[PDB]
């Protein structure tokens, strides 16, 4: 904002991290039902953590409810709470499920279409 | 403490003024008094003082004396020819090398 | 080494002296520039002013 | 009635090297119960000892009385310990298992 002697650490990670695979196809949120996903997110993380962390839950929710989310930024922000590779796998697992739900006509992922 | 630069300026002053005018010599130096100029000349800088290693005659002397007149180094010292600080450090030195 | 690939890019001085239009301008280390063709073209422009002699010298300047 | 920097663990230097553990124990049990004792081993720590008492008052009046004790031609230099950092993790598994014992036994929930 006012300082020059510090670098943008986000951009630095934007260069120097190892990211997930589905993180390219931009995604909109109008086309999505979330309240179907929400329990999936909850159980996913709660297992990753062995306990429940409401704040991480709501963090992911709030980062998603935007018009179009940045998968890069989201993987970064979860890298702290989860163990880094867990974040890569988790995001590259949810984001394709997002693509599925969004090309679905009801907006729901094919996993819960089947189940 | 004293630095090579002060020491050489002292040597030159003394060699011009002589060894009783310590007050003008002390005027020549900054952060130095005549008391301290005099002490330095007569402790280390004087070319009469010898900085060699002890002949073992000198060390048998040192030991005999420092037993006969214990703790009296300004009295012991001229009887062997080095300053009291040298006699004293070298005496403790022999004592601990022997201990 | 990708450094040595950039080194595999590094023309020989006669390579440079050949391609460029004015070869006098080319000095020794000019080969080591990440843009040698630019560099020599800019050294051959009119009215410009060459770098000061003492950038390589190990002693400093009027020291 | 204590100032908080009082500890049940004190740091001692100016010990005789190689000093007999039994002496250590009774010299220090001239005050009360000693929970534990450690003597330094690497030459850097050689000659000093951490002593862990089992009683606050024991440790404190030891630091009151013995500080300024002369054995073996040297005064025993003491101080309170500042246990201000941890040095390894507190082992969640056995921790939760012994508290699971607590709860299973005493029927809280």
């Amino acid at each position: 904002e006012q300082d020059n002697r510090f670098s943008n650490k986000q951009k630095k990670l934007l260069k120097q991290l190892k990211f997930a695979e589905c993180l390219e196809k931009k995604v909109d949120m109008s086309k999505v039902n979330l309240e179907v996903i929400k329990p999936w997110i909850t159980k996913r993380v709660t297992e990753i953590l062995g306990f429940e962390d409401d704040v991480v839950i709501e963090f992911i929710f709030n980062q998603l409810e935007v018009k179009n989310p940045d998968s890069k930024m989201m993987q970064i922000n979860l890298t702290g709470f989860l163990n880094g590779k867990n974040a890569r796998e988790f995001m590259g697992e949810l984001w394709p499920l997002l693509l599925s739900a969004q090309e679905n006509i009801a907006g729901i992922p094919s996993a819960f279409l089947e189940l | 403490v004293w630095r090579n630069t002060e020491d050489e300026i002292l040597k030159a002053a003394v060699m011009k003024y002589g060894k009783n005018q310590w007050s003008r010599i002390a005027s020549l130096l900054h952060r130095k008094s005549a008391k301290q100029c005099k002490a330095r000349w007569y402790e280390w800088l004087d070319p009469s003082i010898k900085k060699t290693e002890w002949s073992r005659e000198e060390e048998e002397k040192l030991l005999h004396l420092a037993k006969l007149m214990p703790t009296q180094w300004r009295t012991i010292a001229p009887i062997i020819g080095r300053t009291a600080a040298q006699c004293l450090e070298h005496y403790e030195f022999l004592l601990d090398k022997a201990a | 080494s990708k450094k040595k690939l950039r080194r595999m890019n590094r023309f020989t001085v006669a390579e440079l002296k050949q391609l460029v239009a004015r070869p006098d301008v080319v000095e020794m280390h000019d080969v080591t520039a990440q843009d040698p063709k630019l560099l020599v073209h800019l050294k051959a422009t009119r009215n410009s002013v060459p770098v000061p002699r003492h950038w390589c010298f190990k002693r400093k300047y009027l020291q | 009635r204590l100032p908080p920097e009082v500890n049940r663990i004190l740091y001692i230097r100016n010990l005789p090297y190689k000093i007999t553990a039994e002496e250590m124990y009774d010299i220090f049990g001239k005050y009360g119960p000693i929970r534990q004792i450690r003597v330094g081993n690497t030459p850097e720590t050689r000659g000093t000892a951490y002593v862990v008492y089992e009683d606050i008052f024991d440790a404190k009046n030891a630091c009151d009385h013995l500080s300024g004790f002369n054995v073996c031609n040297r005064y025993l230099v003491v101080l309170y310990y500042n246990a201000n950092r941890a040095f390894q993790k507190m082992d969640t598994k056995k921790k939760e298992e012994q508290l699971k014992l607590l709860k299973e036994k005493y029927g809280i929930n």
Binding site: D3, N4, R5, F6, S7, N8 | - | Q34, D35, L38 | -
Partner: protein
């Protein structure tokens, strides 16, 4: 290291608040590309290079203006790779 990335910091700052500056790692492409873009924005400001150009070709000042602002998105080829 220290000086390296701290002046890399100050220069990222300079540039990002001032498009067009450089650093020790500035390439021929981006140099000449900023140099072209500035040239265009100034042909458009200056009311008389705009005449000169509209008279040298045979267009109208609005079309010439439109063409410049079209070119201003890749004036020197595609990027380096």
């Amino acid at each position: 290291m220290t000086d390296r990335y701290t002046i890399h910091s100050q220069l990222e700052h300079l540039q990002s608040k001032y498009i067009g500056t450089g650093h020790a790692d500035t390439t021929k492409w981006e140099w000449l590309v900023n140099q072209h873009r500035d040239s265009y924005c100034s042909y458009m400001g200056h009311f008389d290079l705009l005449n000169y150009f509209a008279i040298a070709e045979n267009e109208s000042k609005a079309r010439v203006r439109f063409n410049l602002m079209e070119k201003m998105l890749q004036p020197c080829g595609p990027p380096a790779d």
